[PDB]
Amino acid sequence: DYLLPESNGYLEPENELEKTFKVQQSEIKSSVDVSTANKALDLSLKEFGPYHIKYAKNGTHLLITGRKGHVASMDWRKGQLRAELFLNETCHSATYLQNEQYFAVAQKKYTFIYDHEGTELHRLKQHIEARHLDFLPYHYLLVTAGETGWLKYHDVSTGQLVSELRTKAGPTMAMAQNPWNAVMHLGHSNGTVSLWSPSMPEPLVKLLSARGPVNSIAIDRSGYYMATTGADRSMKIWDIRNFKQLHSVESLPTPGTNVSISDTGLLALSRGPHVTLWKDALKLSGDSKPCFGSMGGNPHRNTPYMSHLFAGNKVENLGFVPFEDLLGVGHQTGITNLIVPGAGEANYDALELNPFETKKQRQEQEVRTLLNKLPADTITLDPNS
RNA sequence: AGGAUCAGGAAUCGUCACUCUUUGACUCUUCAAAAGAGCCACUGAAUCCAACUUGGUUGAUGAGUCCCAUAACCUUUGUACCCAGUGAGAAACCGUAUGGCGCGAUGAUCUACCCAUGGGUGGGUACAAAUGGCAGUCUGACAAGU
């Protein structure tokens, strides 16, 4: 416990009169240290479509996918850029599967698996739609939910299809994989998120999450609380460990396009022109219920921790850097990294992921993970069963 | 009982550098062109002539010192060799009872042609040497900067 060398950043009001959420990002960029203040990027690439964002599980490479033709893998911290592909088919998402050397893009029809340089490795005959393209490196399993009812699991270690699960739910409106559990979460128009394992052809458990369609879903690091948003201007705080929505934030001004969860407990809600993050909102009490406005400054009622409004955009998606305190918000013209104080964890474990990794360390670690892949039957509702 | 498909056999390392090779990108680029998201304007840079400046036939520029003119390769004139080696063969007595260089392995013996073992011609090989060949003592008018 005392070996833990680095401690989180904080944000403190210092008055009741002074307010926490009112800080702006140019105002933040004054006091943050120079490399960390400079780690906020403004990539306005206004020519192509709205931009999809994903950092790798280590923050070392950023992958972006504009809706029209852009596919871009930068070695994000440095000036290096690996991939810049212009496919005139339209794309939806992308993820690095194992390392920055191999990634996968979610196109109009077919998923593509791709080299760092931008070369074509593997076009999938299957995956005939691809809306959410997500990965779990602990099974080496690219799990993809298109606009189809089905859900496809490709084991890119072997390079073969594991399984394909028809939901009977229709087009997938959301998918968030569980880091702690590797159960997949699919969200559809009935207000229903289904938990999934590749073995079980019926879902593990269905959840009538909200009314209307599922806008998005996002899961804790601990796998305890998953924050779900419907298109009904509502966001539920599901505690998966006992399958209860802790708080039901009703009547947003606009339904959130996405939700995202940091490591230390931050929650990101992006209505699209606005991005708003709460601190410690996932806890058990309804005092920790995330609320927009606490009248009278009552400590029980909970205000948002950090706010932002995008002027000329309706942003697409967002994702924290997993070890740093920023979050990449993909807007129509591009990418902002909005600086949080305490979102990411300060003390990573190198033996799990390496944010500072040599290429020789990388090819050691890749072989280490491929030795430690699990075959797909081990995806279960509990890791420990 | 012997062989080939799905126990007679070394290989369990959380990488640091260094070098080498390899392919790929890359600014370019020849094969060798051809096509040009086209037009204005603003502004910048570069080049070329004119111009001007400074320096210059009291010499500006151009220039394969070293690959050695300090030579190479010969050519003629004076010497050392060999078709150093050969190695057992060369010449017929003795001061005042007694004493020896009287050879010689530890070396006796020699150093392709004609002429009765006297002399040399011819070729290869090496050097000294050349005021010998091969092998005939630079340019000279712009340059450079804006």
Report the distance from CA of residue A115 to the C1' of nucleotide B23 in Å, as an integer.
15
Question: Measured between alpha carbons, how far is A216 from A327 in angstroms, rounded to an integer?
Answer: 17
Report the distance from CA of residue A83 to the C1' of nucleotide B132 in Å, as an integer.
78
For residue A249, give every residue at least 6 positions away whose Cβ sits within 8 Å of its Cβ, in sequence order, or none.
A234, A235, A236, A237, A289, A290, A291
Q: Which nucleotides of B are covered by protein (CB under 7 A)?
A: 14-17, 24-25
The H or E element spanning position A28 is: helix A25-31
**Angle formed at CA A88 by CA A84 and CA A93, multiple of 5 degrees:** 65
- The data reach a resolution, in angstroms, of 4.3
The closest of A327, A267, A241, A253 to A53, measured between CA atoms, is A327
- Count H helices, E strands: chain A? 3, 28
C-beta atoms surrounding A73 within 10 Å? 28
| Chain breaks of chain A after residues with C–N above 2.5 Å | none
Report the distance from CA of residue A311 to the C1' of nucleotide B146 in Å, as an integer.
53
E strand segments, A80-234:
81-86, 93-96, 103-106, 111-114, 120-123, 132-136, 141-145, 152-155, 160-164, 174-177, 184-188, 192-196, 205-208, 214-219, 225-230
**Cβ pair A344, A264 in contact under 8 A:** yes
**Cβ pair A232, A313 in contact under 8 A:** no
Please tell me the experimental approach by which this structure was elucidated: cryo-EM
* A197 three-class SS: coil
A3 touches strand B (CB under 7 A): no
Question: Measured between alpha carbons, how far is A346 from A320 in angstroms, rounded to an integer?
Answer: 13
Query: What is the length of chain A?
Result: 385
